[PDB]
Amino acid sequence: MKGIILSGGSGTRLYPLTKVVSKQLLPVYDKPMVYYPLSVLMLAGIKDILIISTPEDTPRFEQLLGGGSELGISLSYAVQSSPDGLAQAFIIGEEFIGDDNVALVLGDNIFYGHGFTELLQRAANRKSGATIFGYNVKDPQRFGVVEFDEKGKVISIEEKPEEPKSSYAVTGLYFYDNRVVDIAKNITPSARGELEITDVNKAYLELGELHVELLGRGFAWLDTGTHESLLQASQFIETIEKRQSLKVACLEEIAYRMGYISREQLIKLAEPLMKNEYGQYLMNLAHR
């Protein structure tokens, strides 16, 4: 499976932080926001990843993250000239995707919890259908909403219903079989002017192969939508990391733990960063 991080948008809520740059370049505590969703694809076992952003921000992501080789993966880049909807990732990424299965994650989504990598790996290893991930939120009318039965099978999915059928939002992480490319090419803009991911998921529902993984209350799916929520996300990460000796979404660590790079390669990554706490963390991991 390949992966895509959709990381543009004409985001304005966070002005003036985003006066120049896209939100996914902003810090969440001690690392750029984009590291979080990238870490999720990597933990899923996904090693070939396309990052899509605006004309002006795509080169900024490439300067930050590089070509992937340091992390034992492959990062590629494409431009979305206008934020015409999430489903457009699969049209921009047509050539990249080829005949393969593909996961999409949003560049501003942050997931965290015990047992999450088991779920990710399961979704990435599926050879047919789609997997979406549902999460209980306070104001579900503001999200895509997945309705399911007592056995956890999807009954419906609706984009920002005025009368939500459940309390479960459909989060910004999606795993698809290769049918997603032609599905994306066949749906039409909503009233919003957007090629809606909810429409892609409706198509998989109708095909009888939309699977939902319900993330319980022991998971965090953090809001980076406002200044207030960005700050709460930062504090959440700080708290988890301060207590343990352990980082959330440290890319070099994940590359080593996943077998993408060797202990030898991790040491070489740590060496030039030994003046800062981040390099020292990588070196400790190498030793231990």
Ligand X SMILES: Cc1cn([C@H]2C[C@H](O)[C@@H](CO)O2)c(=O)[nH]c1=O
Residue ranges binding ligand X (CB under 6 A): 6-9, 11, 39, 43, 80, 83-86, 88, 106, 108, 112-114, 116-117, 194, 248-249, 253-254, 257
66 is in an annotated binding site: no
The 3 state secondary structure assigned to 207-248 is CCCEEEEEECCCCEEECCCCHHHHHHHHHHHHHHHHHCCCCC
Q: How far is the CB of 194 from ligand X (least distance, A)?
A: 5
* Residue 11 marked as a ligand binder: yes
108 labelled ligand-binding: yes
Query: Least distance to ligand X from the beta carbon of 7, Å?
Result: 6
User: Mapping DSSP to helix (H, G, I), strand (E, B) and coil, where does residue 52 land?
Assistant: strand
According to DSSP H, which parts of the chain are helical? 35-43, 58-65, 89-92, 94-97, 116-124, 180-186, 197-206, 227-243, 251-257, 263-270, 277-287
- Ligand-binding annotation for 144, yes or no, is yes
Closest by Cα among 172, 225, 221, 231 to 14: 225
Is 160 flagged in the annotation as binding? yes
Per the DSSP assignment, residues forming a β-bridge with 77 are 51
**Pair of tokens at residue 237:** 């990460």
Rounded alpha-carbon distances, angstroms, from residue 163 to 121, 143, 171, 193, 202: 34, 12, 19, 22, 18
Position closest to ligand X via CB: 9
Least separation in angstroms between residue 149's CB and ligand X is 28
Q: Is 115 annotated as a binding residue?
A: yes
85 is in an annotated binding site: yes
CA distances from 274 to 9, 68, 277 (A): 36, 21, 7
Q: Which is nearer to ligand X, 61 or 168 (CB)?
A: 61
**Taking the complex as a whole, how short is the minimal distance between the CB of residue 82 and ligand X, in angstroms?**
7
Contact 86, 40 (CB under 8 A): no
Q: Which is nearer to ligand X, 83 or 161 (CB)?
A: 83
Nearest distance from residue 278's CB to ligand X, in Å? Answer: 14
In the annotated binding site, the residues are: 8, 10-13, 23, 80, 83, 85, 108-109, 113-117, 144, 159-160, 170, 192, 249, 253
In the annotated binding site for UDP-alpha-D-galactose, the residues are: 8, 80, 85, 108, 144, 159-160, 170, 192
In the annotated binding site for alpha-D-glucose 1-phosphate, the residues are: 109, 144, 159-160, 170
In the annotated binding site for UDP-alpha-D-glucose, the residues are: 8, 23, 80, 85, 108, 144, 159-160, 170, 192
